[PDB]
Design a protein around this ligand. Structure first.
Ligand SMILES: CN1CCN(C(=O)c2ccc(F)c(F)c2)CC1
Ligand SMILES: [Cl-]
Ligand SMILES: [Mg+2]
Ligand SMILES: [Mg+2]
Ligand SMILES: [Mg+2]
Ligand SMILES: [Mg+2]
Lengths: 194, 194
């Protein structure tokens, strides 16, 4: 029933554009929507976000997260390792690379989602969510070497998967940080699972 | 270390703006960022709510109630948690219960409400509260739930068993062009990993 008729550039930057989208509502009535897109896609998706499951024997399984200053938020956020996928990179390869860059950990692909939307009322940004395990007992992960590209400043925060939501709520309480919605949703479902 | 120096408007629409953000990096170097923000945020603790709605029904498996809508930014149909912006002076809990009723017909009961979490913090300042709500599907109020879609809202309801949520999402994705939301996919993934 519904579809795009046309778009109108409102404003284009180096990284992001605002369009005014004209679409046909299912009654036959034409309507407008202000939409954001990145200027960077070719690709399966804009980005990958990595769920990294750090597995060490005789230890709790942890989920590895990153803390970074996010200029649009004006503050520090707690997030899954993530970045944009390069021209000709697969989502998997991007995932392993971003994970190593942001955390120093070297991991193995467990599974890879289809492209999923980030905020579909506002943008067209999509990602692949990529579940990766990290054999934390392997010598290559003993003193993990985080290799940031230019301007990245990433703190690594590993939390136990069995108490993830309580641990995240504590950090928010004591630290004035914003947790990412996908991180919080995953933590919620860990508690909700039956 | 890091903080905002200035926020210069690039373009302001009726509902979304684009800003040039100048900030201080942790090396003491000034950098900039293109940031998206909504124009609708007042004193609300967040832009919006998303509802994790747990439909409970004696001798049924618990379902997660989802919605499918056309999303003009995406140019297609998306499957999401029920969600909407918080009205000025409305509480997040109130906004969740109202939005859930408008989009699905169901009258829920509040279970928990997250702090403000960031939607896509490399891109925008947008935040939500994620509100978990139980729906007593044995209550006669919830028997034949009628959506009250607002002007230009056209929402289909999709209830899926919690115990098979990821496989059922994968099946819906397999059989038609539609994108699953990242927060939904994240929650379904954690249901599997638990
Ligand atoms: C009230 N009508 C006007 C048209 N419409 C929008 O243009 C819109 C509102 C907020 C957004 F963030 C956005 F991206 C788009 C909403 C429905
Ligand atoms: Cl796993
Ligand atoms: Mg990143
Ligand atoms: Mg990176
Ligand atoms: Mg909505
Ligand atoms: Mg609504």
């Amino acid at each position: 029933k519904q579809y795009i008729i046309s778009e109108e550039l409102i404003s284009e930057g180096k990284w992001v554009k605002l369009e005014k989208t004209t679409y046909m509502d299912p009654t036959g009535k034409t309507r407008t929507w202000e939409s954001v897109k990145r200027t960077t896609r070719k690709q399966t998706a804009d980005g990958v976000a990595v769920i990294p499951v750090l597995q060490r024997t005789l230890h709790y399984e942890c989920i590895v997260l990153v803390k970074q200053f996010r200029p649009p938020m004006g503050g520090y956020c707690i997030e899954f390792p993530a970045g944009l996928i390069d021209d000709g990179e697969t989502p998997e390869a991007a995932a392993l690379r971003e994970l190593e860059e942001e955390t120093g950990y070297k991991g193995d692909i467990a599974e890879c989602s289809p492209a999923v939307c980030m905020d579909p009322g506002l943008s067209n940004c999509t990602i692949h969510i990529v579940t990766v395990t990290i054999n934390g007992d392997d010598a290559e992960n003993a003193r993990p070497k985080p290799k940031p590209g230019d301007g990245e400043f990433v703190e690594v925060i590993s939390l136990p998967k069995n108490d993830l939501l309580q641990r995240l709520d504590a950090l928010v309480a004591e630290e004035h940080l914003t947790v990412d919605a996908r991180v919080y949703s995953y933590a919620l479902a860990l508690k909700h699972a039956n």
